[PDB]
C-alpha cells in the first residue's frame, strides 16, 4: 500500500455533525489518524438515522477511531489533555468559547504540546458578540443571503435542499488544515485555524455581494416543445453558433442583443425570444443538437436522474462500506490522486469503540 | 512580514474564469508565487466588468498575480512554456479534457523534464471518458449534477441557483488538493498529478441527498410564516424542540403523538409546520428571531445580499479589503480561512495582461 500525505499524523475531532467531521474524514482519506470524541452513547449524529427501507454521520466518519468521554468530569479533562499531548492536529466545531470552559482551549492544549495545530470551527467566528451564536447549515445560509434572487410560488424564502454550507466548509476547514501542516513543516510554525460557515458562505456567493460593496446572458434554463434546457453560450463565438443551430441568425445582428452588455439588460426579451425558437425541439433533441456543436448545455437532472446516468458511473464516485446486509453505498471526496487512492473502506466506529486504546489509566 | 506557508513555492495557473483562478487566488493568500499565462489580449473574463468598471469574475480571484501573455498554438511559447514550468513547483490548468497533451504541455511532457513538479487539473466532468470531455462552467455543471431538484418556481422552471457555488467550492477543493500535493512532496517525496472535477464536487455537495438514491427530516428546520416577514427556525434536537414550545406558548405539542418524537416531526412537518405558525402568527419575524436568539435556539431572518453587507456581523469579520492605491479602490471579500500566526490577504491589485512578460519570457 502506497504512501499517503498524512501517514503518521494524529487527529483529535472533537466535532459533530456534518461540516467538521467531513474535514476530518478528508484527513481519514489523505492517511491521518483521525480519532472521534464523543459523548457518553455516541455523537447525537449517530442516532438522527432518517433512512429505513443514518445520512449525516455514516459518509462522514469512515475509518475513524473513536472514544467516548464525558468532559464533565475532571477525570475526562485529563485524559483529553494526555491524548492532546500525542496529537498533531486538533479538530472542534463547538459554540464559540465552549472549548475554553471545558479547559481545553487553545491556550490550555498548546501550552503543553508546542507542535499541536489548533483547528476552530464555528458558524459566525467568533471574533465578537454577533458571532457568538451557534449555528447550522439552514440558519447560516440563510443569514448569509443565499435566498436571494430566488422568488416561490408562495412567497417564502428559497431554501436549499442540500448542506452546501456545511459540506463547502468542511473542505474549507480540511485545506486550512492542510496548509497548517506545510506552515508547521516549512516554517516550524504550529498555527491556530479558523474557519467560519458564515465567512464560507459569504465567499460562494462573492461575485454578487460584490456588487453591493461598491449577469451574463444567455445563461438560464430555456422552455423547449418537452421539458427543459439549460444553456450557457454568452461568449460572442457561442452566442453567435447558438443562434445559428436554434435557426435565428436575425438574434445575432439584433440591436437589442448584438452586444453582451446589452442581452443582460433585455434578459426577459432574449428568453422570450429564445424560447420561441426552442419551441421546434425537444429539450433532449436540443441537448444533442447543441453538445455536438460544442456549445454548454445540458438537462436539469433530478437526484434520482443523476444517479444514473453514465457520467455519473463514469467518475467512480461511490463506495460500498460494510459487511453484507449492513453495506451501504456512499460518495466518495471529490479530490483525486495518481499515487495513491483518497478513499477508506473502513466502515465508521461504534462509540467508544477505541476507549481502551487511547484513554489512560 | 512574516512567514506563510508557500513562499518560495511557484504556481504556473493556466486557468480562467472563476474555479481554477480562486484556487490560484488561495495559494496567493498562503505566499505562493503564482504566474497567470494568458492569450494575447489576457483572459476572457478580465473583460466581464459593470458600470460605476468592476470585473466581477476575474479581479476578486487574481490579486497579487502575476501575468504572461502567449499563443500557446506556437512552437515558440510551447518551448517558452516548458523553460518555465522548469522553475515552477506546481502546474494550474482547466482547460477542456486532452487540450494540454494537444498543445504538447500535458502531465507526461511537463514532468518528464521536471520530476518535482506537482500538475493539477481542473475539469468540467472529470474527463475520465466521452461523457466527461465535455467543457462546463458553473450553470450547467450544477443543473446536471441535480441542483435544481425540489425547489419550485414560479414560472415552473428549473430554479437557477444565482451565485456560483459550484466554481467557489472547487477552487477551495482543488486548492486543498494542491496543498495535500505539496505536503506528499515534503514528507513522501513524491510529486503527484491531482484531479478536480466540478461535477464531483457538485456532487460530494449533495451527498446527503443523493445518498438516498443510492441504497434505494430533523423538523422543525426551516422557513416559517409570521405576521410580519418569514423566519427561519432549526430546532430539531430535544433540548431545542422544547424550548421552543414553551417560547411560542404551545406546551401540547412536546408529548403531542404527531410531533412527540423527532422522526414524527419528520414525517408529518406539514402539519407541525401549520401548528407552529399558527403560533407564531402573534409576532413579526423580527420580534420572534431575537427572542429565540436570546434564548440560545438557531434562527434568522433570510436577509438580501443588500442587507448582509449592512449587518454588523459581516463588519465583525473582516470580510473585506480594498484593492489599490488612495480613493481608486475596489472593495472585493477575502478568502474564508484565518491564520493566528498570518494573514492570509494581499492587498496587491492583478497584474494587467502580459505585465510580466519581460520578466519571464527573457530574451535578455
Ligand atoms: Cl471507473
Not at 442540500?162 to 463547502?168: E, G, K, P, S
Not at 453582451?260 to 429564445?274: C, F, G, M, V
Not at 449492513?326 to 462509540?351: G, K, M, Q
Request: aromatic content about 6%; overall charge negative.
Amino acid at each position: 500500500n502506497p504512501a499517503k500525505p498524512l501517514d503518521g499524523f494524529r487527529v483529535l475531532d472533537f466535532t459533530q455533525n456534518v461540516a467538521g467531521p467531513l474535514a476530518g474524514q478528508v484527513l481519514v482519506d489523505l492517511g491521518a489518524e483521525v480519532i472521534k470524541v464523543e459523548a457518553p452513547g455516541g455523537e447525537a449524529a449517530r442516532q438522527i438515522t432518517s433512512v429505513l427501507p443514518a445520512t449525516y454521520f455514516l459518509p462522514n466518519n469512515r475509518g475513524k477511531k473513536s472514544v467516548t468521554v464525558d468532559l464533565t468530569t475532571e477525570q475526562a479533562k485529563q485524559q483529553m489533555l494526555r491524548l492532546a499531548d500525542t496529537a498533531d492536529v486538533v479538530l472542534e466545531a463547538f459554540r464559540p468559547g465552549t472549548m475554553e470552559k471545558l479547559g481545553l482551549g487553545p491556550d490550555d492544549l498548546r501550552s503543553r504540546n508546542p507542535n499541536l495545530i489548533y483547528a476552530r470551527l464555528t458558524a459566525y467566528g467568533g471574533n465578537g458578540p454577533h458571532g457568538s451564536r451557534p449555528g447550522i447549515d439552514l440558519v447560516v445560509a440563510a443569514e448569509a443571503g443565499m435566498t436571494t434572487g430566488m422568488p416561490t410560488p408562495e412567497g417564502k424564502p428559497q431554501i436549499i435542499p442540500f448542506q452546501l454550507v456545511a459540506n463547502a466548509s468542511g473542505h474549507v476547514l480540511a485545506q486550512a488544515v492542510l496548509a497548517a501542516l506545510l506552515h508547521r513543516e516549512r516554517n516550524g510554525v504550529a498555527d491556530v485555524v479558523q474557519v467560519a460557515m458564515y465567512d464560507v458562505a459569504v465567499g460562494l456567493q462573492a461575485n454578487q455581494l460584490m456588487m453591493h460593496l461598491n449577469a451574463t446572458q444567455p445563461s438560464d434554463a430555456f422552455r423547449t416543445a418537452d421539458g427543459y434546457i439549460v444553456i450557457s453560450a454568452y461568449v460572442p463565438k457561442h452566442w453567435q453558433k447558438l443562434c445559428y443551430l436554434i435557426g435565428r441568425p436575425d438574434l445575432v445582428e439584433d440591436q437589442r442583443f448584438a452586444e453582451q452588455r446589452s442581452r443582460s439588460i433585455n434578459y426577459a426579451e432574449l428568453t422570450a425570444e429564445l424560447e420561441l425558437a426552442l419551441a421546434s425541439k425537444t429539450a433532449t433533441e436540443w441537448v444533442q443538437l447543441l453538445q455536438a456543436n460544442g456549445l454548454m448545455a445540458c438537462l436539469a437532472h433530478t437526484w434520482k436522474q443523476v444517479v444514473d446516468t453514465p457520467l455519473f458511473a463514469e467518475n467512480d464516485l461511490t463506495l460500498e462500506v460494510g459487511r453484507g446486509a449492513d453495506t451501504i453505498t456512499v460518495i466518495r471526496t471529490p479530490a483525486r490522486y495518481a499515487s495513491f487512492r483518497a478513499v477508506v473502506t473502513d466502515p465508521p466506529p461504534t462509540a467508544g469503540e477505541h476507549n481502551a486504546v487511547f484513554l489512560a489509566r
